Structure formats: structure tokens, C-alpha cells
Amino acid sequence: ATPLTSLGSERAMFHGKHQPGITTPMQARGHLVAFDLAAGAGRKEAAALLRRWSDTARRLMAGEPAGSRDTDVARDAGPSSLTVTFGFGHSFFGRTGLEEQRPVALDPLPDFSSDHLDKNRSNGDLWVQIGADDALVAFHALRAIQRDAGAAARVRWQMNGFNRSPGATAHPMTARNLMGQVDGTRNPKPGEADFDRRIFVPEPAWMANGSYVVVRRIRMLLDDWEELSLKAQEDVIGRRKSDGAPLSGGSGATESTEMDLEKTDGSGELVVPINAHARITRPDQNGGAAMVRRPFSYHDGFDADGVPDAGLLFVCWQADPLRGFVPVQRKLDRGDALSQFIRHEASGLFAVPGGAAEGEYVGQRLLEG
């Protein structure tokens, strides 16, 4: 049986073809942070920053302290599956005089009618995703990365997230979200023949083996959601809450059982409703549009009226946003049974390049003089 100490001893690779934090297994603790380059900081300052950040990432992902003046916060813990991932926003390129290298894929997301975005908690020059299965390890990484910014960049926004911890269930299982739904079942899987083309830029050149991430802070309107009946909730998604099986599934069905989108009930109504979330998001309903969803849940407290600031830190990965998040979200905007129960309140789109080779730093091909 897998030992408890494996929570701490497990580690992800920093160096490799792809950056960690994309196909890396879900982590119990997450920090998303965006930085803006400081006044007077340009391409040279950005290059030095990414070099510092990569060195910090390399050390901490191996469970080692920072190079100098380590805080000891993560001392005695193993790497705990820590990953650090770096991305570049549209604005980064104007700030560094690198507009020639700005991918078309970074063109601004649509202004969807259902958007309620806080501009101050959205976008940014630089994005860092930190995740681990230990909270001190995760915070230690966040603080080290943030302190590495120094005079070169400032924290624009920062969000905390969480997921199920390793060992919480008797067997490895798909995660749940705060709506109580099984969440993550139908992601494209490594090993599928079209996975690389769906998710990664093929081998501008600086983005080779990279991916595009869309981040959305989506508040769940739990006060309304939880007033619904179980049947009503399951109709919104088109899958059962108990096990994640399609509503069209029999008693032996599981989350992986194929949808039957034609099956009707006693009343002649579609068993998986025509507006069900897990119907209308499918690649086969969106001209092949696909993405890898790798989110965190969040809860940041209650307001004066007792409304929870809680939901999903939606994070999705694709080779081209126009072949992933964007067409799907265009459809969900007004067509999704789920839309009235959620609010998109922050947004980001970042170019996440390939992994660092040994002796190199993340984004080196882009930033090197």
C-alpha cells in the first residue's frame, strides 16, 4: 500500500520538454499570481527575473531551500509534488518591446455578455501557477517567487485555491468541486493520438512545446444552487452527482460510460438535456474544440449578507484558445443551464512556453539578448 510519507516525498520534474503544472496530477493547494513589470523594467529586467524565477523553481521543486536567505518555512518537508509554471500575458510584449514575438493566440478573449470581470484582478504581464500537496511548501514557494520579483515587478493579483488531499479517498478518484459535482472526467488524455495537437504548440518559435492557459475566477452562486432539487442539479450538468455517470447511464454506469445524447425519458424528453453543461461542452458539439481543465476550488470568506465568496479557479490548457475555451464559452454564455448559477469575476490569458532544459531558464528563447 502507498505510504503516507509519499505525500511529501513525491516530486515533479522541473526540466523537460513541457513545463510542469499542465499534465501534472491535481494538487491539494494552489496559488495563482499575476505580476506587472515595474516602471522602468524592460526586456533585460524581464530576462533576469525569469532566470531568478527558474532557479528558484528548480531548487524548490527538488525540496531544496532558496539559494540565499531561505525562510525555513518548508524545512523538513519533502517536495510534496510542488510545481511552478510561468506564463506571459498579451501586455508583456509591449512592455518589453517584443511585439514581433507576441503570438496571435494571445489576442484578447471576447467580452462575453455574462462577463462580470474585475479588471484589477484580471490579466497582467506575467503569470505564475504554484501548486503542491503541502500548504507550507506551497506558501514557501509563493513567497520565494514573489520576493524574487524585487524591484522588477509587482504583484498585480493573487488567488488561493485548494483541492482534495492525497489519501482522502480509499482509491484514486476524480476530484469534486464545491457544487458537489464530479469534476474532471472527460479531459483529453496523454496517449490519445490527438492529445499533443489539442494541447501543445508543435515543435512564434519561442512557444514551441508550450500551451495557452485561460484562467477564470468563477464564483458559484451556492445560495441559489443549493436551493435546487437533486434532480434539477443533475439536469444542469447532465451527469449524476453520486458517481459522475451520464444521466443516460444504467445502474452499472460510471463517469467513463459513454453519453447517450439521443435517449429519451418516459415523457419523450432527452435524458441528457439539450442545454446540459456536459453535453454542450463536448468537442463533438463544438467542431472539435478541446482543452485540459486543471482547476482549483476557492473560498475566501463571506460578505455582510452571508454570501460565500466561493467557486472554481477554472484553469484550462489548449494549443490555441480559438480551438478551445473561446468557442465553448461563446456557446455557454447564454446556452448553458449552468450559467445562471455562476459568475465569471476575473480572467486571464497567458502564453506558457516549453519546459526549461538543463542549464536554461523558462522563456529563454524569447528573452535572451
| CB 33, min distance to a copy of itself, A | 8
Residues that are catalytic: 183
In angstroms, the CA 188 to CA 292 distance is: 6
Asked if 76 is part of the footprint of a copy of itself (rule: CB under 8 A), the reply reads yes
Asked if 80 is part of the footprint of a copy of itself (rule: CB under 8 A), the reply reads yes
| CB 244, min distance to a copy of itself, A | 10
The full DSSP string for 287-356 is TT---EE--EEEEEEE-TT--EEEEEEEEEEES-GGGTHHHHHHHHHHH-TTGGGEEEEEEEEEEE-PPP
In angstroms, the CA 337 to CA 317 distance is: 23
164 binds, among ligand HEM, a copy of itself, none (CB under 5 to 8 A by kind): a copy of itself
Whichever of 2 and 340 has its CB closer to a copy of itself, that residue is 2
x/- letters, 286..325, toward ligand HEM (CB under 6 A): -----x-x-----------------xx-x----------x
Q: Residues near 12 by Cβ (< 8 Å), separated by ≥ 6?
A: 20, 21, 24, 61, 79, 81, 82, 83
Q: Closest residue to ligand HEM, Cβ-based? A: 186
Burial 123-151 (b: 16+ CB within 10 A, else e): bbbbbbbbbbbbbebbbbbbbbbbebbee
Tell me: is residue 180 an annotated ligand-binding position: no
Asked if 177 is part of the footprint of ligand HEM (rule: CB under 6 A), the reply reads yes
Interface pick for a copy of itself out of 6, 91, 185, 209 (rule CB under 8 A): 6
Amino acid symbol at 334 = R
| CB 80, min distance to ligand HEM, A | 22
| CB 302, min distance to ligand HEM, A | 18
Are β-strands 29-37 and 342-352 bridged in parallel, bridged antiparallel, or unpaired? unpaired
Tell me: is residue 277 an annotated ligand-binding position: yes
Closest residue by Cα to residue 50 from 270, 356, 260: 356
| CB 78, min distance to a copy of itself, A | 7
CB of 233 closer than 8 Å to CB of 225? yes
C-alpha triplet 350, 352, 358: angle, nearest 5°: 155
Tell me: is residue 219 an annotated ligand-binding position: no
In angstroms, the CA 327 to CA 287 distance is: 9
Asked if 275 is part of the footprint of ligand HEM (rule: CB under 6 A), the reply reads no
CB of 33 closer than 8 Å to CB of 315? no
- Residues in the chain after which the chain is broken, C→N over 2.5 Å: 203
Tell me: is residue 301 an annotated ligand-binding position: no
Interface pick for a copy of itself out of 24, 211, 281, 297 (rule CB under 8 A): 297
Whichever of 42 and 150 has its CB closer to a copy of itself, that residue is 150
Tell me: is residue 184 an annotated ligand-binding position: yes
Whichever of 10 and 345 has its CB closer to ligand HEM, that residue is 345
The site for a copy of itself (CB under 8 A) is made up of 1-9, 28-29, 69-73, 75-78, 80, 133-137, 139, 142-143, 146-147, 154-155, 158-160, 162-170, 173, 176-181, 222, 226, 241-242, 297, 299-302, 306, 308, 310
Binding residues for heme b: 184-186, 277, 293, 314
